[PDB]
Amino acid sequence: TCPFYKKIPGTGFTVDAFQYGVVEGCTAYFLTHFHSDHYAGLSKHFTFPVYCSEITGNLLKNKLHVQEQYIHPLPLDTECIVNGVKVVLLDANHCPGAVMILFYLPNGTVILHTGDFRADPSMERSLLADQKVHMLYLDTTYCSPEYTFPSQQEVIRFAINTAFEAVTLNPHALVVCGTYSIGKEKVFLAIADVLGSKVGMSQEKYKTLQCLNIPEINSLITTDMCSSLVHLLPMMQINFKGLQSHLKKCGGKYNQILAFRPTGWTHSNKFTRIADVIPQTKGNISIYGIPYSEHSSYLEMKRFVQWLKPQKIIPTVNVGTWKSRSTMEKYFREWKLEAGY
Ligand code: NI
């Protein structure tokens, strides 16, 4: 049974609602981005129209084998008519192909669904500037003041410098970066660029990266692992056991591993500056946890919402406990009283 916060009132539309079977009255299923919690339920046997970005469409076709006739890609920043309702897709600053959706209801109501997003001041000069939003369906993943983390630029700077230093000291070292989904590709692409290397990876991961419309991608990645000094591995293998085993595999070409686990927030954010971050070390292996977020900080979320001044807010994350829901409602009221809407 589909929950209320995935329904768009006064339309036949749902958002990210693929795990409930056939939804009663739904004529179009929107998908905000290609992350499993959101696509959960789609497969090659789906026969309803799916509306999404070009990138999300490339992934549905190639990775999930959804048939072409049910995939409806829309350009960004463009007024489109779907089943007689005007819609716009906006970049969400999340993972590749992730969108926010603006719906202009036939009765005059305007609704923004953020999907997953990392709010940014640049969004204040999109097509959002032009008119009023009555309802906001908000990605509230980090809606609490304890959730602080640095910009994505500062995090990339720390990784580039760390990696370049280590490999310049030891030309026989290997950099490994963990992944479990699309997103956060800048981590491994920036490190490989500074080292003058391609990024090596499995055939399955190469196929995923080939769907993302990244410029010059053929110049950046490869399946020939041993030609490369940046490798990608599944996130679950980024530990001393998994990396010991990986170090065997190149035929003793490498005598040191430096590894990155991009997480979201961890409690070490409440005490440690990014510059001050230190790895866990065992012998010739070091693992760095780095706070590369593709969701809004509390401060970024507050700024966006105070700027948008919506009439109602519906959270889409952390909605399962009464304590969570109560905490989020208190912050929405402070923000409104502080700004005066
Ligand atoms: Ni996501």
Curated annotation (Swiss-Prot):
UniProt GO BP: cell division; double-strand break repair via nonhomologous end joining; interstrand cross-link repair
Effect of mutating residue 295 to A: Impaired nuclear focus formation, reduced interaction with PIAS and increased sensitivity to cisplatin
Keywords per UniProt: Cell cycle, Cell division, DNA damage, DNA repair, Hydrolase, Isopeptide bond, Metal-binding, Mitosis, Nucleus, Phosphoprotein, Ubl conjugation, Zinc, Zinc-finger
Disulfide bonds: none
Tissue expression: Expressed in brain, heart, kidney, liver, pancreas, placenta and skeletal muscle.
Keyword hit for Nucleus: yes
Outcome of swapping residue 139 to N: Impaired nuclear focus formation, reduced interaction with PIAS and increased sensitivity to cisplatin
GO MF annotation, one: zinc ion binding
Function statement: May be required for DNA interstrand cross-link repair. Also required for checkpoint mediated cell cycle arrest in early prophase in response to mitotic spindle poisons. Possesses beta-lactamase activity, catalyzing the hydrolysis of penicillin G and nitrocefin. Exhibits no activity towards other beta-lactam antibiotic classes including cephalosporins (cefotaxime) and carbapenems (imipenem).
UniProt record similarity statement: Belongs to the DNA repair metallo-beta-lactamase (DRMBL) family.
Official protein name in the record: DNA cross-link repair 1A protein
Species in which this protein is naturally found: Homo sapiens
Lineage, top ranks: Eukaryota, Metazoa, Chordata, Craniata, Vertebrata
